[PDB]
Design an enzyme around this catalytic site. Structure first.
Site, PDB file in Angstrom:
ATOM      1  N   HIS A   1      39.851  43.877  34.683  1.00 48.75           N
ATOM      2  CA  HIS A   1      39.381  42.522  35.040  1.00 48.75           C
ATOM      3  C   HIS A   1      40.318  41.521  35.625  1.00 48.75           C
ATOM      4  CE1 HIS A   1      38.000  44.104  31.154  1.00 48.75           C
ATOM      5  NE2 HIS A   1      36.789  44.104  31.571  1.00 48.75           N
TER       6      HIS A   1
ATOM      7  N   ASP B   1      44.680  45.240  35.576  1.00 46.75           N
ATOM      8  CA  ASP B   1      43.688  44.979  34.794  1.00 46.75           C
ATOM      9  C   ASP B   1      42.389  45.337  35.477  1.00 46.75           C
ATOM     10  OD1 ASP B   1      41.796  43.593  33.172  1.00 46.75           O
ATOM     11  OD2 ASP B   1      43.490  42.039  32.607  1.00 46.75           O
TER      12      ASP B   1
ATOM     13  N   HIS C   1      41.028  34.742  26.546  1.00 48.05           N
ATOM     14  CA  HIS C   1      41.882  35.907  27.276  1.00 48.05           C
ATOM     15  C   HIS C   1      41.076  36.591  28.458  1.00 48.05           C
ATOM     16  CE1 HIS C   1      39.140  39.819  26.422  1.00 48.05           C
ATOM     17  NE2 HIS C   1      38.262  38.832  26.499  1.00 48.05           N
TER      18      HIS C   1
ATOM     19  N   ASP D   1      40.435  38.286  35.056  1.00 51.96           N
ATOM     20  CA  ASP D   1      40.888  37.115  33.962  1.00 51.96           C
ATOM     21  C   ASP D   1      41.092  35.661  34.691  1.00 51.96           C
ATOM     22  OD1 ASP D   1      40.767  39.414  32.187  1.00 51.96           O
ATOM     23  OD2 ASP D   1      42.816  39.500  31.981  1.00 51.96           O
TER      24      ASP D   1
ATOM     25  N   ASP E   1      43.466  47.820  29.441  1.00 54.98           N
ATOM     26  CA  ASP E   1      42.445  48.479  29.867  1.00 54.98           C
ATOM     27  C   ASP E   1      42.312  48.583  31.167  1.00 54.98           C
ATOM     28  OD1 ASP E   1      41.658  45.720  31.326  1.00 54.98           O
ATOM     29  OD2 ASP E   1      40.641  45.053  29.614  1.00 54.98           O
TER      30      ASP E   1
ATOM     31  N   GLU F   1      46.778  43.939  25.009  1.00 54.24           N
ATOM     32  CA  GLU F   1      45.367  44.355  24.639  1.00 54.24           C
ATOM     33  C   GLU F   1      45.320  45.537  23.886  1.00 54.24           C
ATOM     34  OE1 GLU F   1      42.592  42.538  24.349  1.00 54.24           O
ATOM     35  OE2 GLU F   1      43.428  40.964  25.894  1.00 54.24           O
TER      36      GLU F   1
ATOM     37  N   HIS G   1      45.279  39.008  26.187  1.00 55.80           N
ATOM     38  CA  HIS G   1      45.800  38.688  27.425  1.00 55.80           C
ATOM     39  C   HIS G   1      45.870  37.178  27.613  1.00 55.80           C
ATOM     40  CE1 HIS G   1      46.486  40.786  31.596  1.00 55.80           C
ATOM     41  NE2 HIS G   1      47.448  40.261  31.010  1.00 55.80           N
TER      42      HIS G   1
ATOM     43  N   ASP H   1      47.442  44.737  31.609  1.00 58.24           N
ATOM     44  CA  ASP H   1      46.447  44.658  30.689  1.00 58.24           C
ATOM     45  C   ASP H   1      46.283  46.218  30.249  1.00 58.24           C
ATOM     46  OD1 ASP H   1      43.960  45.145  29.018  1.00 58.24           O
ATOM     47  OD2 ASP H   1      43.019  43.337  30.277  1.00 58.24           O
TER      48      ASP H   1
HETATM   49  N1  LIG Z   1      38.131  42.300  29.090  1.00 59.73           N
HETATM   50  C1  LIG Z   1      38.118  41.117  30.233  1.00 59.73           C
HETATM   51  N2  LIG Z   1      39.157  40.812  30.755  1.00 59.73           N
HETATM   52  O1  LIG Z   1      40.372  41.419  30.264  1.00 59.73           O
HETATM   53  N3  LIG Z   1      36.964  40.731  30.204  1.00 59.73           N
HETATM   54  C2  LIG Z   1      36.480  39.534  31.286  1.00 59.73           C
HETATM   55  C3  LIG Z   1      35.192  38.980  31.227  1.00 59.73           C
HETATM   56  N4  LIG Z   1      34.984  38.049  32.482  1.00 59.73           N
HETATM   57  C4  LIG Z   1      34.951  37.739  30.274  1.00 59.73           C
HETATM   58  O2  LIG Z   1      35.027  36.655  30.745  1.00 59.73           O
HETATM   59  O3  LIG Z   1      35.041  38.066  29.261  1.00 59.73           O
HETATM   60 MN   LIG Z   2      43.204  41.054  30.870  1.00 63.43          MN
HETATM   61 MN   LIG Z   3      41.020  43.650  31.103  1.00 62.38          MN
END
Ligand SMILES: N/C(=N\O)NC[C@H](N)C(=O)O
Ligand SMILES: [Mn+2]
Ligand SMILES: [Mn+2]
Ligand SMILES: N/C(=N\O)NC[C@H](N)C(=O)O
Ligand SMILES: N/C(=N\O)NC[C@H](N)C(=O)O
Ligand SMILES: [Mn+2]
Ligand SMILES: [Mn+2]
Ligand SMILES: [Mn+2]
Ligand SMILES: [Mn+2]
Lengths: 314, 314, 314
Positions: B121, B119, B136, B123, B229, B272, B96, B227
């Site tokens: 998340h 998402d 990402h 991000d 996920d 992703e 991402h 995303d």
């Molecule tokens: N999978 C993901 N975001 O898409 N993870 C976010 C998690 N805050 C990280 O900072 O790595």
């Molecule tokens: Mn993402």
């Molecule tokens: Mn995500």
């Protein structure tokens, strides 16, 4: 009220062999015994014996037109007879092509009946709009009055008489509709609730609407034609045409619980259960149990529970 | 309307190798051919070749800042060019982080665009608030105007210009947000629909609200950064950061079906999908088919069906 | 606020061996450490040692009445003690029969507490209405005032004092209720939300209603007795009595997120996790992780995310 189970072990409505075994698996699962535990009188009529039409050449693209036409003609006769006697018919079938006869017979005694079709498919293809001559995908096309004469006469179906119009049928579970079928449902103005409408509204509102739409004005006999593939493959995997993103087990029972409450259920079909399509014995058991569950729900079994009247359990 | 598929096989946005293979799998699954079957003109721009920045030392905690900054700056250029020509861009990506360039390029031609971010998340971590220097997980932080200067300049991103504000972005599917990110979304007043709001309201109301919120006043280009996920691991298992309790396959298509209906989709990112993270070939097929499904839905495919205009199937 | 985890490794409430291992798995999964990461003070009281009653003959049909009566008497004492000290008790159990002591102890300090029972079952069978002498299915029957004297006194439960009435309990997730139980809930007018009501209303409205019903007039301590089989077997498979069509992971966390928000949670039980009933190691991990997830949700963890107060992450 009396219930009559009619077995329809037929499979020529589609490619895959096995659906004809559907009725035996449903009974083996105890469908009849469990039904008797409800407040209804249950009579089991047994399975119908279908005479195979020899040299059944395909009508253009339609396959086994004569075997399918004759099998349905016989079922319609049988269903008409039981409806006549004031019983609710329950057709345990092979493929969905047998709906032609189920609804036809039913309509003969109750011409003002409406239909609720639970299926991932519209099964409204005509002999001309079919990519596969498989009749289990063309049941509604033979039943609709607005579709009369919009396709050549097929060998074995001359006995059929369009008994319902586009305003008497509601679909619930659509997600795999062919272009021709989509042209037909839009053109005819048929009411439907594809999965997008189920997601948008929620099954609760969906039922609320399907009913005000079909029962609002007049209260009339309800015919529920249930294609097991209407549920997601995770619930009813042993079926010939599974489609991801289906209705859930919960939603299916909701539908049947709500149809039970109207007190208007007059005809029922539990189709496409193919005991041989289960990748694992469990997948067949799952499918069979769910189909049995839906049938029992149509006749009273509530997830909130049930208790016999006039009995003081204390 | 014209569609331009732009492959972004990039993976330095996160630790797991494989996402760069995302574009190839999506195509192998027939994404392009299937798109052509829709009412849109489809052109495949091919995959971009990303020049690897040698000796890319980590900026404090941020990893591969230069490789990621340069890969995006290149994508942004390409997306700006296609948007310029009046086409809808479709970015098939690795991780991402490539959203930085997708949206940046898009904003250059359509500065009034709004963003819908599906998402699990947010991000929105900044170089200072990441527990992992994985970019990402910091895309939105580089794009937000309200976050400009709230973090040191990172090698390779000087070309980036905050193009959207906190009022032009809506999140759907939140369930794994870091403390810093949660402080940022609450502080900035960003609109979001985590899973709890999706459960509370239902996806139908959720979409209704995200549009009145972003489109109530003015109608503007919509950029959908998806995303994978965001959907539950049961649907899109082959991803680097799966989170249980996700959006269902049905809800995902609903979102895409609704965004298609607005007629405002101007940019899209399907990210992703990591073909190598599938525990079984089926888990990868599942993920890929679902990603393809959502893409086709964004461009017309309806679960209720579709039929070609001016064609009388009868 | 302080939290006290009390392990109840008891299994004589039902036939299946293994639930007594529930507490150990829950801890092994990091339940205690994860709780400490929340805003609450966490103290682990450890597991209680239950003295096995020798020659525990079955009372008519009820099995191990004395072992179950004494085990609960001990727990109630322990829970009363901690409640007394102003802490929120958290009972990690074996089978649900231990709810007798959990709630009994709780009621001693907080007599005006109300109960929210998440279970696929009503567990309200009396010694006379059970088809198995399994006590894990009769907890509520010993606690209800309206059921006092409607059944013979059972060896080992003379210490029990009906502490809640039919108006202080709300069930959520019902789908497998025996006739006697259904007669009892209807007769007593108890309030419930079986899966049909969950499907109809949506979990959002369900919670809204359970609270106005129990909290409308007076705000009072809330006791949450959570039977893991209340969620669908796909989510919590490692349990002795799984029932298809259950609440979803999402709906489970919604319930717990909402109960957390009231700020009224005073007592909690996480029951029926049986680490030995997992067909695969994954099935046990799934169940354990979900049980831990719900517990953490009860104490603050939001799916939208969390961030520590007074901390500027920027
Ligand atoms: N999978 C993901 N975001 O898409 N993870 C976010 C998690 N805050 C990280 O900072 O790595
Ligand atoms: Mn993402
Ligand atoms: Mn995500
Ligand atoms: N499965 C099924 N209907 O039930 N498929 C319908 C598809 N239109 C066909 O024409 O074969
Ligand atoms: N699993 C369970 N309750 O939790 N079963 C209840 C069932 N009524 C029994 O009496 O054994
Ligand atoms: Mn079908
Ligand atoms: Mn069908
Ligand atoms: Mn239970
Ligand atoms: Mn229980």
């Amino acid at each position: 009220k009396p219930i009559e189970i009619i077995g329809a072990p037929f499979s020529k409505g589609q490619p895959r062999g096995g659906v004809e075994k559907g009725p035996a698996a449903l009974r083996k699962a105890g469908l009849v015994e469990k039904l008797k535990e409800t407040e209804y009188n249950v009579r089991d009529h047994g399975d119908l014996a279908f005479v195979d039409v020899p040299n059944d050449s395909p009508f253009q693209i339609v396959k086994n037109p004569r075997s399918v036409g004759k099998a349905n003609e016989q079922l319609a006769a049988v269903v008409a007879e039981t409806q006549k006697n004031g019983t609710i018919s329950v057709v345990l079938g092979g493929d969905h092509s047998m709906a032609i006869g189920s609804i036809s017979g039913h309509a003969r005694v109750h011409p003002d009946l409406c239909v609720i079709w639970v299926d991932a498919h519209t099964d409204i293809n005509t002999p001309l709009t079919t990519s596969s001559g498989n009749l289990h995908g063309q049941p509604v096309a033979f039943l609709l009055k607005e579709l009369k004469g919009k396709f050549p006469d097929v060998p074995g179906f001359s006995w059929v008489t369009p008994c319902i119009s586009a305003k008497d049928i509601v679909y619930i579970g659509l997600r795999d509709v062919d272009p021709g079928e989509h042209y037909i449902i839009k053109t005819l103005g048929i009411k439907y609730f594809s999965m997008t409408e189920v997601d948008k509204l929620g099954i609760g509102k969906v039922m609320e609407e399907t009913f005000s739409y079909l029962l609002g004005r007049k209260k009339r006999p309800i015919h529920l034609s249930f294609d097991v593939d209407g549920l997601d493959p995770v619930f009813t995997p042993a079926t010939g045409t599974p489609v991801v993103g289906g209705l859930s087990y919960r939603e299916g029972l909701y539908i049947t619980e709500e149809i039970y409450k109207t007190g208007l259920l007059s005809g029922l079909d539990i189709m496409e259960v193919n005991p041989t399509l289960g990748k694992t014995p469990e997948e067949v058991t799952r499918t069979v149990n769910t189909a049995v569950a839906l049938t029992l729900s149509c006749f009273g079994t509530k997830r909130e529970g049930n208790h016999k009247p006039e009995t003081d359990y204390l």
